[PDB]
Amino acid sequence: QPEPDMITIFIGTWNMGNAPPPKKITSWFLSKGQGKTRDDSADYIPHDIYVIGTQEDPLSEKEWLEILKHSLQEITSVTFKTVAIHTLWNIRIVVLAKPEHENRISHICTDNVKTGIANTLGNKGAVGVSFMFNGTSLGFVNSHLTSGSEKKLRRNQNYMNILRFLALGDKKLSPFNITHRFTHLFWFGDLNYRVDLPTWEAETIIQKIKQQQYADLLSHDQLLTERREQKVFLHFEEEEITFAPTYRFERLTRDKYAYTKQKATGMKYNLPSWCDRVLWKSYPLVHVVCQSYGSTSDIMTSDHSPVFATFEAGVTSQFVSKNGPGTVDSQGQIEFLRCYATLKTKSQTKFYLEFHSSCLESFVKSQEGENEEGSEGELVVKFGETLPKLKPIISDPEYLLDQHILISIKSSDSDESYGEGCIALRLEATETQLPIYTPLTHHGELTGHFQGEIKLQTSQ
């Protein structure tokens, strides 16, 4: 039975509004309703992995698992295995997988982050799951961010705290946050970004939604605007939104948006908004294709509609050779030529690099680079041809060209990372000097760039 080179992943996010679900929720797992929907001809084909994020979830873990497994069994006639379940307050993540994947999945991690301080600590935050699927690392984050149209900057702060403090994936990747630890990272939830239009325009917005004319509303969506201005979710993708706003509905119908201020809302307006979102970030040149992104029309117990997204994702096999694992393959080498980091920092410490990759036995520390002043006020750290030659565990090009090198640039004085990035080994040529590039981030904000040339030797 051959190992897959592709899997499909279902991501669901639903703010349940503290109410039990209706008896039938299969439309969610089938990607049916509004937006980019799944073809009827696929309905019996199970996804490989189902990741369900809930917010304001009133069920026990047992109660929800029973509903989820019974839903998937009805659709697919497959009894899914539970990979992980993790709940913080009323924020929950469930990962289910086809039974045939049980002995492909390992290194399962769970964690949560509580956002806010005092007043604002006690209900918002994020839960996450990571694991290995054969050679491929997968991370999943379900966040419920701060509510309210006038709190976009709080949501951005919540995002930065979650990506700093959520402890998933390989703890040896110590310079790297969750935005660099995974081949594929899916981040979803009630992100709570709103359509930023005046309150007086509520009925106009409703009109537009009835006409399925979303363009003038999406141009005011806070998440799209904040992402365009590089304030949040830097280097993440989101499929185009072609479904109606998923909040705030009157319960038991989808015919009415309930936007007006009420005691129950703290006298806040809730103009129709795309609160409920799925974003992802995959390593460079890895196959990832969104095949659905939409909302259900027939699940009406909450003031939010459920959102679905499905993905094709490239995966690799757990490679063994006669040499690695447990030794180097001397027919393999990675040389970084004429590399330099450009940093936004005002500091004047010396810097060194760390190269991290599961194609190495352990991470590699470089010598300190040579600091120069850049023309427009920046720091340029030059590494020349000084960088250590990297010795991969396996030389086979079928393995090595699918790998990635994570780079951290660290201060000699503090050993703290000033920037993290990633280089694909999916090159146009081997034994050939080829340009490489990554942006560098720290705490998920842009701090610089790393560019140079690479020369990759494989056994072929």
**Site residues (vs ligand JO1, CB under 6 A):** 81-84, 97, 101-102, 105, 108
Inter-residue contact 146 to 162 (CB < 8 Å): no
- Taking the C-alpha atoms of residue 263 and residue 245, their distance in angstroms, rounded to an integer, is 23
Residue (315 or 387) nearer to ligand JO1, CB: 315
Q: For tokens 């799209």, what's the residue? A: 224
Q: How far is the CB of 182 from ligand JO1 (least distance, A)?
A: 17
Inter-residue contact 11 to 309 (CB < 8 Å): yes
The one-letter amino acid code at 58 reads P
Q: How far is the CB of 62 from ligand JO1 (least distance, A)?
A: 12
Residue (48 or 396) nearer to ligand JO1, CB: 48
Give the dihedral sign, CA 231/235/241/247.
negative
Quick one: tokens of 66?
Answer: 């029973």
Q: How far is the CB of 403 from ligand JO1 (least distance, A)?
A: 24
Q: Please give the full DSSP string across 360-414, using - where no structure is assigned.
A: SSS-EEPPP-EEEE-TTS-EEEEEET-SPPB--S---HHHHTT-EEEEEEEETTT
Residue 257: is it exposed, middle or buried by C-beta count within 10 angstroms (0-12/13-18/19+)? Answer: buried
Residue (105 or 456) nearer to ligand JO1, CB: 105
- Taking the C-alpha atoms of residue 62 and residue 64, their distance in angstroms, rounded to an integer, is 6
Residue (72 or 163) nearer to ligand JO1, CB: 72
Residue (99 or 374) nearer to ligand JO1, CB: 99
Q: How far is the CB of 222 from ligand JO1 (least distance, A)?
A: 36
Q: How far is the CB of 165 from ligand JO1 (least distance, A)?
A: 23
- Taking the C-alpha atoms of residue 444 and residue 232, their distance in angstroms, rounded to an integer, is 8
Residue (36 or 101) nearer to ligand JO1, CB: 101
Q: How far is the CB of 82 from ligand JO1 (least distance, A)?
A: 4
Q: How far is the CB of 108 from ligand JO1 (least distance, A)?
A: 6
Quick one: tokens of 90?
Answer: 């009323």
Quick one: tokens of 239?
Answer: 């499929």
Helix count and strand count (H, E) for the chain: 8, 21
Q: Which of 264, 257, 193, 245 is nearest to 224 (CA)?
A: 193
Total residues found in the chain within this entry: 460
Q: How far is the CB of 256 from ligand JO1 (least distance, A)?
A: 40
Residue (138 or 307) nearer to ligand JO1, CB: 138
How would you write 138-158 as a 3-class SS string?
EEEEEEECCCCCCCHHHHHHH
Residue (103 or 253) nearer to ligand JO1, CB: 103
